[model samples]
Target: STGSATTTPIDSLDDAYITPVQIGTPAQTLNLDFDTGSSDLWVFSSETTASEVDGQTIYTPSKSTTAKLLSGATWSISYGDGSSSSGDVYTDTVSVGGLTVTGQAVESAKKVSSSFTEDSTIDGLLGLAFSTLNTVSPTQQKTFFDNAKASLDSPVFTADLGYHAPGTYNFGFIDTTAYTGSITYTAVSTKQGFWEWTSTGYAVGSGTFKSTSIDGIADTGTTLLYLPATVVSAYWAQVSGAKSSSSVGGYVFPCSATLPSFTFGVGSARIVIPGDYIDFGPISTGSSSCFGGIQSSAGIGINIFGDVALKAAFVVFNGATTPTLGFASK
Candidate 1:
């Protein structure tokens, strides 16, 4: 029942996701992606012989003074984008910021794809989304927060993204002076590794409101926010002269007009997403348009609120203590 919290911003590399974590008794660091789409901590290893793993960062146990590989264990992960990687299990003493956790579980993907291998910026993904999507077994599961929560002065974690730059991801305690005390707690639906929830209604502009009920998941790993078709069309209707065209298998709007704020009402609370967030990144598709945050998932019925939405709010996954998810102002 806190009013607000202060955030410790960890400098994140552009497209490079890693948090300093300690493994075992000695201090060691691992590259980690603060991914909300899934729950788990996975890293590349030296044992990987996959050709695609050449350029990607690999965790070398020899480099760390306190690292050990778990014998007779294996790990693998498949992404929604059809990319996957797998390898043997390893244990290390991981530390992030000032927090330390011992004997943490890690994955070393031997057969990583080109997409992951080529991206030198991205080392590994840290799934902070939810526990339901955890790939780690109950016998081997260990999260960065789970291990360090007891050592923290407060029961809160905060992520502060750099303005127009890769920002910092910090955990431990939350400073209460940074935000309004109006925190809206949502009941999480145990779905995939994603934190799924139902949006009660949506509002566009001043009066063009739509009574649309939508179910989607919030993911921190994804850069773009995706929504359903019905929700997308309803939202675009409010955009002034917003035209849609095909770009990167999704629809994009090509007008330079300032888009209206779209609000999603969840229970008694409302999450407002700015118009610019809906704009997609510029690619060589010859379509410089405002992209709909909501995309066509065929019949998946799953929408994802990626980093675009997450960077706007201070979200808390309270699986460590409660059966609920917490949200507060940053």
Candidate 2:
């Protein structure tokens, strides 16, 4: 065993949290997104096509004596945003925050999508989700959290992912100071390889509870919130001149629109998502149009409580027994 994985690196550029992970024997530091939705630890590499890599850094396995090729094994991943990557596998030491996990599977990219190559802030992903979500072919890959959980003080971690602010993801321990009030938890079913739970009801604009339940996943890898189309329409209807712009690809409202607050019931707690956060800033530079952070999950079967809503709460992901998600006001 190489040893434990340890956390505060945020990209802050276009809104993605990233951490520096050291790999190989001598340790080549690579900035990777701490993604909870995926289970692949892939990085831009020398094997990547020169035209696709742009100016992003690449991981060279041949230089590291500890890096071993996983022959006959390959991996490929595609994101909802159309970003994709594929490559062969290598086993090497991985260091994050202050912990180290040895012999971890690292997928070195041979080809990358245009979206990934353009986003220079992130070199790869340090997937913290369930190992069942891994994308490695032939054999599933285990995550850093899985390898380090036994050595942690607790089989849990806290994600204090802030909105454009540097947030903390503490391993092995829960920092009470990061959140307030009691933590209301709901059962999470990992059957889908995601941290998924259900909400009892929801309300728009401080209105009465709609008594509508929704099953969703908390994904740090995603940037925007995606709920059912009806829910998204209901919220957008409240705004003046709010419509789903085909070019913009989301519900957008005039910058002058006054959006109402939104809330969701989780067990005994009512998690609030502020209206200001719902307005995902201006759609483009110098444009008065603004896109709603909440989008429609018209095709995807499950609701995704992405960054917009999660940034408003301090989430406690307990991987131990039962696998529950604890939510508290930040």
Candidate 3:
């Protein structure tokens, strides 16, 4: 089976994109964040604390006759951004872009962090990472993608993320028209439960390309591109007024600064991200300083090729026994 779904950017900053997922027998639809960085399909439901529920939609397991309680099962997940959610489990029919998976384990949240509650646009997350990262207790549950892989025409999914606009997620097959040039394939390491790969090198603007290897994960759930402090400093040094700000926590510069493009290598392919993309919006409303989309991954201990880098190209995640990643310019 093959499926395609539209993912729309919900905020002005292009923080995250969401897709509509239908759950249960009666089909309660909810907008879910399709995150590749984690492997826990959790959602806000009737079981969620009333205090945690705001204007976002909630799933009611009791309303669906086909819903089954996964007795004694529980799940809790924490993100790198410090947001956390925890709850019990349920098995029900889940549909994404017409691709149906029966008895999909759906974690119904009983508690959620204030950040999640404040962000009322999304209902929950539909994890697309490897099943090894699932947080279910005793018996780790498989992710929705993992459960549906066997039925897919090809055990693969593609992400076409757009900047400040709508994107698309295609399962089972790749849309040849979505990208330009040939896709450069790279081996993926699943030991970290992430789509981790090594980049050939990087070039700041029209400058010389550094022939060094940089290991990182392709994370759609994250908002910025994080690299080693040395790499990040080299990038910021090019901007006339850019500086690392202690108060702001990262690099910041005048909103009017003329930023340069960023290019990263995947084998011999050079994908260039426009200068405007590097100049992430203003740090504060009506503020003169703007934040840089590329930051140092110092404290995090891992480099992340997040949305800032993903929006520049088309990505394919192959979920075979031995996984691989494909990147192509659009």
Candidate 4:
């Protein structure tokens, strides 16, 4: 009923992390992008246009006797970063870590958006968001997590993401040894199909605590922290030589800048995001310029506590009525 898996980062993509998953009876293993921002389990497949697939591994349902075709069922997915995929559907045995779900709906791709077509490192995506966001036609499909939750002892999962390091995603039960201190809980508003929550305000470095409310989501699929433009500008203003770089598409500062830590309120708990994490490494411009991982969520209305903000702490995603998030220092 309960199972867990570790995910490894793809250095080149910077935004990609993968988990090993098995499909069908014979169990063909595939590397999947475990995305928390969307719902649906899809994989590169024989149906995909050969040219669109590049060199990534593909799943062939015909090879497995247990694979079943879902008649007239199709799926299409699009991401915030513009990646997209469309395909037919199949029901088969799918396993993550050691947990197996029988008759799981697996979308097999026939076409992919250019972003996906170009990123050959990403074979497919295993969306961990709410089942409501699943894009299956006619009959909506549930995610692997949704299908697997009923059997889990605790309908929950923990995301222990790391920076340039391997991370683990554990299900069913929380591993106390994985974190330090107590986990502070916050109510989740899931109407948006994400683990959305409200921040009781935040502060830059050790400055006075701000008392404004900010709504955000804990999105492991994304790599940067996107806050409102006003909030982002205020944080960057503290760093000397920091400027909004049109070329880099965000704020960039001298690599030598000494940044401060960011802290936010979750109910009565205070969680701090280190200043270093806000510096998303050096810019690709071959200069001594570093990009600010805390960028403006200008286009998107809500803030996103992405990998940059999440890697600082351990998180528990509770999938219950009145969903909540539990956070602890690592």
Which candidate has the highest lDDT of all? Answer: 3
Task: Tell me the whole-model lDDT of each prediction, alpha carbons only.
Answer: 0.61, 0.82, 0.93, 0.87
Q: Where is model 1 poorest over a 10-residue stretch in terms of lDDT?
A: 1-10
Question: Lowest summed lDDT over 10 consecutive residues: which window, candidate 4?
Answer: 9-18
Clashes of each: 27, 2, 0, 0
Q: What is the descending lDDT order?
A: 3, 4, 2, 1
Per-residue alpha-carbon lDDT of model 3 for 164-205, expressed as tens digits? Answer: 899999999989999999999998999899999999989999
Q: 1 or 4: which has the higher lDDT?
A: 4
| Candidate 3 overall lDDT versus native | 0.93
Using TM-score as the measure, name the better of candidate 2 and candidate 4: 4
10 residues in a row with least lDDT, candidate 2: 1-10
Q: For residues 1-330, could you state the per-residue lDDT of candidate 1 as single tens digits?
A: 121212222233122234544444434445567776766677766777756665555677767666676777776678877777777766777666655566777766677776788665556777666555556543556566666667676555565443235545556555455446666777777645556776677776565456666677766676655677766676677666654565456665554657766776666666666666565544345546545554565555578766656655666655546545555544
lDDT over C-alpha atoms for residue 164 of model 4: 72
Q: After superposition, how far is residue 215 of candidate 2 from its true place, in Å?
A: 0.3
Q: Candidate 2: global Cα-lDDT?
A: 0.82
Q: Summarize candidate 4's per-residue lDDT along 78-176 as a digit string, tens digits.
A: 888877889999999999889889999999999998877777777899988899999999889998988988899899988998767888888888999
Residue-level lDDT for 87 in candidate 1: 73
Query: Would you list the rank order by TM-score, best first?
Result: 3, 4, 2, 1
Residue-by-residue lDDT tens digits, candidate 2, 210-292: 87778998888888889999888888888889999889888989999888888877886888888886876688888889878
On the 0 to 100 scale, the lDDT of residue 258 in model 1 is: 70
